[PDB]
Amino acid sequence: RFASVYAWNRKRISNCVADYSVLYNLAPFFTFKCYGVSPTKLNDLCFTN
Amino acid sequence: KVSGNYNYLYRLFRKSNLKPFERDISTEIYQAGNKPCNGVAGFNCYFPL
Amino acid sequence: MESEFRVYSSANNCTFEYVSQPFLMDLEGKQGNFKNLREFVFKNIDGYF
């Protein structure tokens, strides 16, 4: 349980290593949407945070 | 138009990169997993163009 | 005689039609030393047939 739309709970842009491969390819997907970068391409864009 | 030129259709996904000077006409609901999601919608089962 | 002019039962919007003079045909043919010998090779590169 996190906060509402006025004070949306943000994990800061700071220094943890993740994995875009298995995290983006879960089974229960009902609504996924991306504007600037296509939803089919998420792995090959990464920085320090 | 002020109502929007909603006539030209773009693509955003394919199974593999196509060789040049090639065109396709077919539009099929995508399957991107072990489950044969033919259907009308589902996990990465979207309209092509 | 050649019946069934439309060997396809149905045709959608056709992208291109071409009609020209036929190849070097030979009417009938003598048994032994047949005049007709078709030697065709079909190649494609990058759309060129």
Ligand SMILES: *[C@@H]1O[C@H](CO)[C@@H](O[C@@H]2O[C@H](CO)[C@@H](O)[C@H](O)[C@H]2NC(C)=O)[C@H](O)[C@H]1NC(C)=O
């Ligand atoms: C021409 O059509 C064939 C289908 O017969 C395409 O081949 C498919 O390519 C995808 C790409 O990942 C494969 O997943 C399919 O398994 C292939 N089909 C078969 C039957 O093997 C081919 O890609 C098409 N040509 C172009 C340039 O797209």
Ligand SMILES: *[C@@H]1O[C@H](CO)[C@@H](O)[C@H](O)[C@H]1NC(C)=O
């Ligand atoms: C053959 O050519 C004639 C052109 O005079 C055309 O009208 C006809 O439809 C053609 N038939 C086939 C089977 O292609």
